[PDB]
Amino acid sequence: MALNLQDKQAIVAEVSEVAKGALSAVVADSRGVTVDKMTELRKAGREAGVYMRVVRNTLLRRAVEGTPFECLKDAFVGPTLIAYSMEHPGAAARLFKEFAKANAKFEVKAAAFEGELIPASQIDRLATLPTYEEAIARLMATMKEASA
Amino acid sequence: MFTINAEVRKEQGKGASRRLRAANKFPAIIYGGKEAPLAIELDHDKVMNMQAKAEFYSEVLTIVVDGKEIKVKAQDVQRHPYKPKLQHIDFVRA
């Protein structure tokens, strides 16, 4: 631990992502291994690049320190170990769905999917944020509904 | 800026000094300029913790006696021969 000019930077990045972000999920790395975070590394890298950062910050004065500003409901998501996956450009694209599918491979746990603060709820694994660019499914029935 | 507190010595001598030292105090004196040498006692622990740092002795210090600040500089100091203790101190007016 350094003094105060070192912890505040962790909180600075945390508050920057918490406020300037989007849908995010939770990954309770009670016993993190080498390939768990690696698979999540590829998972987040597909998100446009390096903006889906996930560090092992579960402290009340680290990750809960940036709760007062934005995401003011992480006090209940601040106990034992909660790796907040704050997002960045875009939307909820697949972080929730990908996390559910990765957490279902016995990768450590996620505190029963505690959840971040997008909606007006707490814990609800929704699949209504996958498709957000598709614009070619409305051009498949035009050359089959003309003869008849 | 070190600020020492002190009292004027009623009785001076060998026995008196010994008594002071027994009672966690120790004598000291101020001298310099036109003014007459002023004998005072000091609480020992405070001043030992003080004189530990080196700046005590280089810088100017303020002695409070009878509610009056005298600015002095530590000139000389008697130490106990085989203990981390102060027998006596010389202060010069500054």
Partner: protein
Amino acid sequence: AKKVQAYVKLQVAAGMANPSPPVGPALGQQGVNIMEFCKAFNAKTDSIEKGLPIPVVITVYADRSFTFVTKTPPAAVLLKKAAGIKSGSGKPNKDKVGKISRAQLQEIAQTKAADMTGADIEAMTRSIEGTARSMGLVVED
């Protein structure tokens, strides 16, 4: 990938999957089959390149039939066939004599970007710098 058996990586010959002295029977004997190393590994080897060291990892448990898997080349050996001096030093580590290229060390690390944590593409090249300076090879940037 979430679980692993076991694995014995070793720089084997691509050109012909049939070595005696280097590996041969030591490349698999504990339930591994040496006859299934020259009917399937070569199948996925006439579509890329053949002749340089190609580590292999065999997925044999006890069911006698395994699933051969691929891997990647070493980054430390990437400054030998794609930089300059093959040895890399020549002399004890006291006097810098090695060298690298400035146009390089960016596209040679993109080939092995399947084993880099750096989520940025340029973040993978900064780790190459340290691996390219193992001895202290000073480059002409």
